[PDB]
Structures are given as C-alpha cells and as structure tokens.
Amino acid sequence: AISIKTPEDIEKMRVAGRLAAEVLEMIEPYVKPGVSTGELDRICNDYIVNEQHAVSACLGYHGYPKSVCISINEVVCHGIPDDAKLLKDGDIVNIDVTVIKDGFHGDTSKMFIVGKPTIMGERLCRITQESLYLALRMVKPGINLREIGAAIQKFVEAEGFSVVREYCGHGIGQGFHEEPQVLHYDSRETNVVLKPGMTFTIEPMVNAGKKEIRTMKDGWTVKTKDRSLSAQYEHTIVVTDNGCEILTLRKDDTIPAIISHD
Ligand SMILES: N[C@@H](CCSC(F)(F)F)C(=O)O
Ligand SMILES: [Co+2]
Ligand SMILES: [Co+2]
Numbered sequence: 660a661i662s663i664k665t666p667e668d669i670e671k672m673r674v675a676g677r678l679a680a681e682v683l684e685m686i687e688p689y690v691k692p693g694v695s696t697g698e699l700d701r702i703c704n705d706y707i708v709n710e711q712h713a714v715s716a717c718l719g720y721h722g723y724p725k726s727v728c729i730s731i732n733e734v735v736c737h738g739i740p741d742d743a744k745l746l747k748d749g750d751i752v753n754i755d756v757t758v759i760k761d762g763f764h765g766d767t768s769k770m771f772i773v774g775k776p777t778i779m780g781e782r783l784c785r786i787t788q789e790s791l792y793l794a795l796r797m798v799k800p801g802i803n804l805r806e807i808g809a810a811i812q813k814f815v816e817a818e819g820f821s822v823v824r825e826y827c828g829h830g831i832g833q834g835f836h837e838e839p840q841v842l843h844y845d846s847r848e849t850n851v852v853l854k855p856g857m858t859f860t861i862e863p864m865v866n867a868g869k870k871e872i873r874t875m876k877d878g879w880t881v882k883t884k885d886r887s888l889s890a891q892y893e894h895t896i897v898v899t900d901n902g903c904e905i906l907t908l909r910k911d912d913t914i915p916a917i918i919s920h921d
C-alpha cells in the first residue's frame with residue numbers, strides 16, 4: 660500500500676519539510692561544548708510548538724519520551740535527550756527531527772561537529788552526507804529502489820566504512836512510517852519501481868567500524884557493537900516527473916533542491 664500524493668498533498672509536505680529543516684538551521688548556534696542534549700531537546704520543542712505552531716511527531720510515538728532524537732558518537736540512532744549528557748570537544752552528534760503540520764510529516768537529520776573536530780569524525784560525517792547525495796542524484800521515475808541501496812553500499816564500503824542494515828528509510832506523508840522500506844544496501848529482496856508522487860526518506864547510517872549494532876536496555880538507544888563512531892543524514896523527498904525534489908533542504912546543503920534528468 661504505497662500512497663501516491665496529490666498535488667495538494669505535496670504542497671503540505673513542502674511546508675512540513677521546510678519547518679523540519681528550519682529546526683536544524685535554528686539549533687546550530689546552540690551546539691557547543693558543555694551544552695546538554697536535554698537542553699537541545701527543550702529548545703527544539705519550544706520552537707516547534709511556540710513559534711512554528713507545529714507538533715513533534717516523536718513525542719509519545721510508541722511511547723518515545725522526548726521531542727527529537729539526539730545521537731552522540733557511537734550511538735547509532737534514537738538517542739534520548741538527557742539533562743545529564745553534556746557535549747565535549749570532538750563529539751559528532753546527529754539531531755533527527757520530525758514535525759507534523761496540517762497533518763503531514765517532515766523528517767530530516769544532520770550531523771553537527773562539536774568544538775574542534777577529530778579527523779575520523781569529520782571524515783565519517785562527510786562520507787555519510789556524500790552517500791546521501793549520491794542516492795538523491797539517482798532518484799527518478801522507473802528506477803528500482805534496489806539500485807539506490809546498492810549504490811550507497813558500494814560507495815560507503817569503498818571508503819572503508821560499513822552500512823547499518825537494520826534501519827532504513829521509509830515512505831512518509833499523513834503517516835510517519837509508510838511503505839516502502841528504503842534499504843541502504845544491496846538486497847535481492849528489494850523490488851520497487853519508483854513513480855512520481857511517491858514521497859519517502861533516504862537516511863543512511865554509517866559506521867566507522869563494523870556494521871553490527873546493539874539495542875540498549877533503555878529500549879531505545881542503539882549503539883555500534885564495536886563502539887566505533889556512527890553517522891547519519893536524512894532528507895524527505897518527492898519523486899517528480901523527471902527526478903526528485905528535496906523537501907527538507909537547508910541553507911547548508913550543497914545539492915540543488917530540484918534534481919532534473921534529461
Ligand atoms: N525521525 C526518525 C524516527 C524517530 S521515532 C523515535 F521513536 F525513534 F523517536 C526516523 O527518521 O524514522
Ligand atoms: Co528522522
Ligand atoms: Co526517517
């Protein structure tokens with residue numbers, strides 16, 4: 660049951676996508692050594708609710724307790740904001756935001772480097788964003804999703820890193836996680852042909868070390884098994900007649916919002 664968005668639907672996604680992107684743009688100046696993730700979460704929440712007049716899709720979802728997910732270093736995803744977790748020089752941190760506006764969702768994330776970067780950290784973040792961009796450039800009607808997953812994997816592994824298998828991109832719209840599942844690796848199981856009007860996310864999680872992950876006892880936090888650094892970037896897109904449009908593009912993205920093939 661893959662939903663195809665109408666033009667009106669697409670209009671609302673553009674708004675939701677822009678709101679989400681804006682939370683990430685807004686938070687940047689607050690990301691510095693000595694700030695806690697709990698504080699970042701509060702600032703985000705206040706902005707979403709009080710300024711944007713929107714709502715966080717994460718709060719209460721399956722019982723999730725906070726408004727955004729903040730994942731530091733070896734935390735792969737779903738890191739839970741906490742007043743006790745302070746950022747230090749060299750940390751790499753993912754902030755994943757999902758906002759709801761007029762019933763439509765906007766889902767996006769980026770990595771931030773705290774204070775003075777480490778060589779590994781900078782490199783990992785770069786490669787991960789590039790793997791996302793590569794995928795975006797391939798999106799167009801008629802192509803099989805499998806090709807995209809395969810390309811990401813090949814790229815990442817060629818750079819000496821690994822791709823997380825367990826978590827993947829997903830359709831999105833009135834629902835947070837809709838069909839289809841967007842795998843970030845090559846799999847004979849994948850068989851989905853793209854068509855215009857489809858909206859989904861691409862959000863590869865890449866590990867500096869081995870691919871294996873582990874879910875923590877808190878039941879949310881996921882970390883790499885070998886404790887290596889992990890990075891992720893995410894954008895929400897719409898498949899167009901000749902390519903794609905990135906709904907959550909920010910001022911710092913270096914890819915064009917509309918990608919055209921011909
Ligand atoms: N924004 C995340 C999901 C966060 S829901 C939570 F339960 F894990 F917070 C995504 O891209 O799927
Ligand atoms: Co997300
Ligand atoms: Co997502």
Ligand code: NA
Binds near residue numbers: 730734751752753888
């Ligand atoms: Na991380």
